Design a binder for this molecule. Structure first.
Ligand SMILES: [Cl-]
Ligand SMILES: [Cl-]
Lengths: 131, 131
């Protein structure tokens, strides 16, 4: 189709289909949340919304599941228990460390079809299009 | 972030957030399904999966809801009732006709930030990346 955002969703679906086959227990939003916590241990939960590309409700559901699976621990602001700080557990570090080369490989199946200049330009257009 | 597919999901989330504000009762996958039925009235349901970018389960759920809202009608293969043909109803035509300029406008908020050459190239890279 000639609609750029339709073809973009089609590319996204192919990338998601490969991701779910290679990492059946870690979606891309879950993976991004773990990468963002690892990049800033103790990050505020609210700041983790933008860092991982999520929403308040979706992140809350996601962190509850990771917490129940021993992958994430959280602490609270004593002045405001609605504020929370997030760390990866040791098990969460192992899960993320094993997933990174897999996620990189899935990304590479698509980005590797582009030259370095094409990859840089693709990124530039996406940022140019964003608000 | 330097990950192209992370920034791409961020662009997708912004585009989805605008879409849901302007068309609160018609998501992009629902809109694409209606556009594909209108482009080929009587299209086989199975062929509508690729045309609208969906899955068998998701399309089945989606067409059931549209059918229950008087937006879609379906007919069956007499030899194999699992095969189905899909049409828009008159109400479905009106819903789609009203939605098209809205969806175009939402697309334009992002694509309009690119020149015609940048838009053509963005599309070319996406197709180059797809399988
Ligand atoms: Cl917080
Ligand atoms: Cl069918």
């Amino acid at each position: 189709r000639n609609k750029a955002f339709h073809q973009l969703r089609q590319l996204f679906q192919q990338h998601t289909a490969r991701w779910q086959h290679e990492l059946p227990d870690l979606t891309k939003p879950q993976y991004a949340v773990m990468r963002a916590i690892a990049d800033k241990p103790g990050i505020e939960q609210v700041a983790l919304i933008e860092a991982a590309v999520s929403t308040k409700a979706t992140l809350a559901e996601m962190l509850a599941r990771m917490e129940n699976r021993g992958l994430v621990r959280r602490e609270h602001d004593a002045a405001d228990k609605r504020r929370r700080f997030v760390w990866l557990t040791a098990e969460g570090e192992k899960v993320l460390a094993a997933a990174i080369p897999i996620g990189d490989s899935v990304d590479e199946e698509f980005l590797g079809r582009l030259s370095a200049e094409e990859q840089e330009l693709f990124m530039q257009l996406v940022r140019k299009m964003m608000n």
